[PDB]
Amino acid sequence: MPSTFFNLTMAFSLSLLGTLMFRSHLMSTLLCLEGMVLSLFIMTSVTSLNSNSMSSMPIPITILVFAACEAAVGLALLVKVSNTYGTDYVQNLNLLQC
Amino acid sequence: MNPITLAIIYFTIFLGPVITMSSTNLMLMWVGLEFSLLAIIPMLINKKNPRSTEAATKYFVTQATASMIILLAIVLNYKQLGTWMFQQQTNGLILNMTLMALSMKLGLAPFHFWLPEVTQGIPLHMGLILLTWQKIAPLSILIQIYPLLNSTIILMLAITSIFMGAWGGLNQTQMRKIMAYSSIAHMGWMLAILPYNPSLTLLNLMIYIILTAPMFMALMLNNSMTINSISLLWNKTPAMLTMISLMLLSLGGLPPLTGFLPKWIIITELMKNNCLIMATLMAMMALLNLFFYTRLIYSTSLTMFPTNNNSKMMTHQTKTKPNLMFSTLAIMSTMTLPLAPQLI
Amino acid sequence: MNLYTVIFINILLSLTLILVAFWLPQMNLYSEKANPYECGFDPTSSARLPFSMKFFLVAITFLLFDLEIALLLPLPWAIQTIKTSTMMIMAFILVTILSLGLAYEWTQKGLEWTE
Amino acid sequence: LLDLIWLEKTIPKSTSTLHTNMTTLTTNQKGLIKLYFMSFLINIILIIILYSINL
Amino acid sequence: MNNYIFVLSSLFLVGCLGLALKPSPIYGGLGLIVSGFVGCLMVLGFGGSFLGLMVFLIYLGGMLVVFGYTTAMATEEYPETWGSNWLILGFLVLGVIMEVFLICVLNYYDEVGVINLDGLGDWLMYEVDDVGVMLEGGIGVAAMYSCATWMMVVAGWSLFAGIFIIIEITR
Amino acid sequence: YPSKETAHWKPPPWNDVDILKEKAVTNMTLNFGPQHPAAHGVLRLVLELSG
Amino acid sequence: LRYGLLAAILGDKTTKKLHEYSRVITVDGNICSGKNKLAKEIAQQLGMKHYPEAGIQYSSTTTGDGRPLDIEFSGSCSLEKFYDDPKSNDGNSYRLQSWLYASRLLQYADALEHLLSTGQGVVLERSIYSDFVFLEAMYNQGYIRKQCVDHYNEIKRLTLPEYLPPHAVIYIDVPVPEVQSRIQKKGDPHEMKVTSAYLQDIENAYKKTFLPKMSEMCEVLVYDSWEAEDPTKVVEDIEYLKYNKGPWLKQDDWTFHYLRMLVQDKTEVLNYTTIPVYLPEITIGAHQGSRIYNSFRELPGRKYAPGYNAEVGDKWIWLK
Amino acid sequence: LKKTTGLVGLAVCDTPHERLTILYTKTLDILKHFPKHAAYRKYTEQITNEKLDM
Amino acid sequence: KFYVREPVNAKPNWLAVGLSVGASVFMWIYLIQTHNEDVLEYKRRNGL
Numbered sequence A: 001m002p003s004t005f006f007n008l009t010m011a012f013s014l015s016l017l018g019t020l021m022f023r024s025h026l027m028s029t030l031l032c033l034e035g036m037v038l039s040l041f042i043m044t045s046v047t048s049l050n051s052n053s054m055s056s057m058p059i060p061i062t063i064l065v066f067a068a069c070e071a072a073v074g075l076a077l078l079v080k081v082s083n084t085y086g087t088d089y090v091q092n093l094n095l096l097q098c
Numbered sequence B: 001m002n003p004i005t006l007a008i009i010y011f012t013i014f015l016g017p018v019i020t021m022s023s024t025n026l027m028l029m030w031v032g033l034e035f036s037l038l039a040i041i042p043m044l045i046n047k048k049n050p051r052s053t054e055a056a057t058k059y060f061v062t063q064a065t066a067s068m069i070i071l072l073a074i075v076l077n078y079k080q081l082g083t084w085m086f087q088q089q090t091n092g093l094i095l096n097m098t099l100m101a102l103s104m105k106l107g108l109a110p111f112h113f114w115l116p117e118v119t120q121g122i123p124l125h126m127g128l129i130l131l132t133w134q135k136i137a138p139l140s141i142l143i144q145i146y147p148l149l150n151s152t153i154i155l156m157l158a159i160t161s162i163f164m165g166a167w168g169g170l171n172q173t174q175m176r177k178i179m180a181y182s183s184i185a186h187m188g189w190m191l192a193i194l195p196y197n198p199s200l201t202l203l204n205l206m207i208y209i210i211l212t213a214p215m216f217m218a219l220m221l222n223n224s225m226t227i228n229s230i231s232l233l234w235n236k237t238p239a240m241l242t243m244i245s246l247m248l249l250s251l252g253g254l255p256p257l258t259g260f261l262p263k264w265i266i267i268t269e270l271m272k273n274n275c276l277i278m279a280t281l282m283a284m285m286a287l288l289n290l291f292f293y294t295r296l297i298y299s300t301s302l303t304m305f306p307t308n309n310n311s312k313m314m315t316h317q318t319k320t321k322p323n324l325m326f327s328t329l330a331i332m333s334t335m336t337l338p339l340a341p342q343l344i
Numbered sequence C: 001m002n003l004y005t006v007i008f009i010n011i012l013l014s015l016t017l018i019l020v021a022f023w024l025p026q027m028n029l030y031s032e033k034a035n036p037y038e039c040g041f042d043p044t045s046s047a048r049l050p051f052s053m054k055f056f057l058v059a060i061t062f063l064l065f066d067l068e069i070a071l072l073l074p075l076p077w078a079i080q081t082i083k084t085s086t087m088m089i090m091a092f093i094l095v096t097i098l099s100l101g102l103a104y105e106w107t108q109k110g111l112e113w114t115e
Numbered sequence D: 001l002l003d004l005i006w007l008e009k010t011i012p013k014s015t016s017t018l019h020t021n022m023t024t025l026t027t028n029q030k031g032l033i034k035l036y037f038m039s040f041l042i043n044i045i046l047i048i049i050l051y052s053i054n055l
Numbered sequence E: 001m002n003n004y005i006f007v008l009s010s011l012f013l014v015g016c017l018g019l020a021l022k023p024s025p026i027y028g029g030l031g032l033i034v035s036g037f038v039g040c041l042m043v044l045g046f047g048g049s050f051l052g053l054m055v056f057l058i059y060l061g062g063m064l065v066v067f068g069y070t071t072a073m074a075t076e077e078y079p080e081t082w083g084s085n086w087l088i089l090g091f092l093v094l095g096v097i098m099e100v101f102l103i104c105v106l107n108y109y110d111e112v113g114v115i116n117l118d119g120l121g122d123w124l125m126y127e128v129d130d131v132g133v134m135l136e137g138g139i140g141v142a143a144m145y146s147c148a149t150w151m152m153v154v155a156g157w158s159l160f161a162g163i164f165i166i167i168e169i170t171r
Numbered sequence F: 001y002p003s004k005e006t007a008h009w010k011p012p013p014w015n016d017v018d019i020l021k022e023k024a025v026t027n028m029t030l031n032f033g034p035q036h037p038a039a040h041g042v043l044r045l046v047l048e049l050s051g
Numbered sequence G: 001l002r003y004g005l006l007a008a009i010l011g012d013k014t015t016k017k018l019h020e021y022s023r024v025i026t027v028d029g030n031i032c033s034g035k036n037k038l039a040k041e042i043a044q045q046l047g048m049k050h051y052p053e054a055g056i057q058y059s060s061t062t063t064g065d066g067r068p069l070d071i072e073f074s075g076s077c078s079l080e081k082f083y084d085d086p087k088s089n090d091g092n093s094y095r096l097q098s099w100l101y102a103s104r105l106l107q108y109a110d111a112l113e114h115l116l117s118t119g120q121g122v123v124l125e126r127s128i129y130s131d132f133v134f135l136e137a138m139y140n141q142g143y144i145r146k147q148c149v150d151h152y153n154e155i156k157r158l159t160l161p162e163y164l165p166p167h168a169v170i171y172i173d174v175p176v177p178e179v180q181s182r183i184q185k186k187g188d189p190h191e192m193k194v195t196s197a198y199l200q201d202i203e204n205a206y207k208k209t210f211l212p213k214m215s216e217m218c219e220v221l222v223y224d225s226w227e228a229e230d231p232t233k234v235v236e237d238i239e240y241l242k243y244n245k246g247p248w249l250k251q252d253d254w255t256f257h258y259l260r261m262l263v264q265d266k267t268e269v270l271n272y273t274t275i276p277v278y279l280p281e282i283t284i285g286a287h288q289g290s291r292i293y294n295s296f297r298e299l300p301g302r303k304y305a306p307g308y309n310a311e312v313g314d315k316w317i318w319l320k
Numbered sequence H: 001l002k003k004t005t006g007l008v009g010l011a012v013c014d015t016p017h018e019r020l021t022i023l024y025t026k027t028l029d030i031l032k033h034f035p036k037h038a039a040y041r042k043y044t045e046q047i048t049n050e051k052l053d054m
Numbered sequence I: 001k002f003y004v005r006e007p008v009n010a011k012p013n014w015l016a017v018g019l020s021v022g023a024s025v026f027m028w029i030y031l032i033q034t035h036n037e038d039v040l041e042y043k044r045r046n047g048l
């Protein structure tokens, strides 16, 4: 358990780091968010299985559901920005500077 | 939007925060946060203009990152204490990360660069929701964990945001961005007094909401969105100038107006707790707010700006837009100090 | 250990067939043979350019419906409950809400491909 | 020399200047999410460091 | 077998590292598929079953839709892989070696703590009901139909509202 | 308060609508033939496809 | 009840009322093209409502007493002064043009509101779509400044996109020599000073922009002078038009509802015409504007709101 | 009333007599502006008058 | 009579007015009864 939790926390940390520093494509940022979602779900799953707490196993599934809903919203926003600018580049998202 | 979408979307925006403040479980508070986040975005992107889409994307990315950080805090607290609520024994880093991520959600500095842009992009009638209704949930999450927060971190964020909002207000000509910066400053006060006595944090939240909503409806009246544009109310709608002046001054926080009561009471509590340096600095820097509100007052009410030929037809045509709630909130926000003891 | 063994055996079999296919045949590599294929004429443009997806809305809707599938997949164990009435009511509400969402999307032309 | 010049420069105008300098220093942001999230990252690191050193 | 779980977690870390480095979305999806598989395996090894399989299923579907979206919008004339960009390659190797060295450092400073490479695999499972029957994670999850109906209500509402929100965002 | 950078900044549009440089729609150009099972051998149908 | 989301839910659906002759026809032509006769006759034969061309007094005539107000309140722009001196250094020309554009916008909003409410059709004499011809002609002649052109185009960009275009346009083509002949015959002392160059610029703008632009979406018919008479022929053509082309086809109840909500509030309609772009021709000084406003807000019936003016003949105020 | 016309795209006209009278009269009007000697005028007027009479 | 567009608020909405006045009188009656009851209960619980 301890080593697994350490590596999983490091994985979430790396995915958060990847989200915080961009790299042009918004789709990649969405994927990094989705990876953090994966890591958090795994954390919860292993914690519950370790503790034999079967009343908290309803909660990782809720995590997945809500993360899926937000990911769908993100994809729709990607579609709209693409319709606006021709690409998904985050550079174009600079109008509101003024 | 068709009626059924309006019903469902507005109902979900209303539901999210209610779940957050009526949930005993951290995962359910997170569910409320996600409800608000998901449901607001379609209202933001309702216009479907290039600026609107970009504002919605900025909001989405920032809020999603904040929610994930909060969820990490929840999961680690679970790993530690086998429960879904923060306890006195909970690791300090978990609470630090929660405060940090809820700060990002709230828009507090130095995570504040996102709020001005989104507010500028989005229309006024949704700017009101963004700067009023969407703060209740995160601040509730903090208030439910107030005894465990970190005084150093909270005071640092609060003073940072006071300074940043005050400085940012000056430069901006846009009303939407000005109201965003005012939001930042008032939230700075709210969080400054949160760890010591959350009742006054809630008092400040109430008064700020009761002052911002009237101002946002005032802007909606003529869709004003710039200093120059609002300068034409002496011609388009003279009646409102008096209350607009009073309300801007109150938000600034002059004594006779209500706006004093939040700042004065918060300074009093901080002094009781021996927070003299931070209290002094915050009070001092809360005067740039009065400056960049007084500029607006000068532009609108005390001086008469040049008008256009075509405003004559605006004069000719009739108007039926100001609500009863405008008058109620405006008076009850700018003429209530003598009832202050009952408020606190 | 059995599942790992059999899956690794399958992997090794497939990879061995590939390696034999790549190291047994006699080869002759030249530019015209290697260049891409497009009905006997040269590519007017590379295939990496944007390719509009005319079913984007249905594609996203698939995500949410699959998560609904996830929410429903516990039913075989759920039915072994004592609160059968509660389980029935909850499952009925879930499926009816699924149906209403699909019906609204249909009536709103979500499933009609975008041109 | 004093009343119309030096006092105005020292007390009012110095303050006015400094605050204008600070607003023009802070407000003008290029408006790009990449840079904004880089700053958020620096906040992340700073909070971590403060927590660690203060123990 | 002693190093089974630790190896799986390290592979998960590497897949997440690649995703963070953010190659083209196609390689991002491939990396996340591998990471989802490894995470499902970790959950399976920790006594789970339904949860691991569910993550794998939902993630396969999600990456399918994501790939479809990438081919249409998130595309470039020359997509960049992990190895194409020399900085990405160098930092991939740097991250791998850095994690190795960090593992060693934590082991040395805390001989028993976050990591116990000596004594690894000795604490995977803590307790098991030897003679039980109803101990399968599917039961706990299905509890949403009886003891946690609030969870079901909120999640179902989330999906329902998602339908309308998505339609009106894409209008 | 204009500064070095803010000189090139311009006032925002009155209505939020912003005039944008046109995004030319570049349909892909497929070669449905000559050698296609449905081209009957000798047709270089230069299809211009969107999606 | 004010038309709102509530009424829309409970009924009042526009598609429930639309009919075959519920259209938005625009009669257009050069000056003295006989537009008014044809407009009235089309409206009468088709059973629709005719809207006279917007003048400098349109808002005053359509609001309050319905009596023409003073020019100081109604724009301070004089068509006669324009003709007498078109390059006057008091900027009357562009003031007149902007006022006329705003009044045409108001008339268009009213006609669209009428169509979407009663379901009846509307006939109009020129409109915001056709208005740019006069501005282009003034600019080409040299009466207005390039900044004024910029300003007008900006306002049109802000306003025009919101409203649906007319169903059909009916352009009467009459050559410039005969335009001058008709103007001489009409014998308006100030109108007789309009120059042939000005008339030809109006005609060029019409043909080379408006008709090509309108034919893209609306149904455009062109009648020469000899065909213009006998309006019954034009009514027949309108009757056997088939509108498969235009933004109108893709509307539905909810789009109509949002358009109705926009038009119903005349303030929102005219909001962007008052953008604070400081152009001297339209800009008014604080003192003059204040004087005009104080004078207006004490005219008989214009001090308080429509329903609360006790002087004109309103009562039950203490309860209203 | 005819339900359909065999030709595709050519839809049924409810008021055929009115439409025909209108079109034929319009043609006869536009013809007046041809020179009176025009062979086109003569022939087209004969044709149109015949069909209008029918 | 004076106005061309029929004044929106031409005659009072008797319904809205009657509701407002009735609510006001009901509120005053309820408040007075409540104040009397509160005084009586305060005396009852504090021995006059």
Ligand SMILES: CCCCCCCCCCCCO[C@@H]1O[C@H](CO)[C@@H](O[C@H]2O[C@H](CO)[C@@H](O)[C@H](O)[C@H]2O)[C@H](O)[C@H]1O
Pocket: D011, D012, D013, D015, D016
């Ligand atoms: C001990 C504590 C008490 C002392 C407190 C002192 C605080 C006083 C603050 C006064 C601020 C007034 O701010 C005032 O802004 C106006 C704007 O019109 C400036 O006005 C001036 O600015 C610049 C000169 O620098 C000129 O280009 C400009 O044309 C002119 O108007 C004044 O120079 C400044 O003084």
Ligand SMILES: CCCCCCCCCCCCO[C@@H]1O[C@H](CO)[C@@H](O[C@H]2O[C@H](CO)[C@@H](O)[C@H](O)[C@H]2O)[C@H](O)[C@H]1O
Pocket: B170, B284, B285, B287, B288, B291, D015, D016, D017, D019, D020
């Ligand atoms: C301890 C906190 C105390 C806070 C209290 C003091 C409040 C200070 C107010 C600062 C803002 C004053 O705002 C003041 O604006 C004027 C113009 O309006 C600026 O002055 C400006 O004038 C013109 C442009 O207008 C330029 O030629 C000049 O170079 C520029 O400086 C001042 O430099 C700025 O200081």
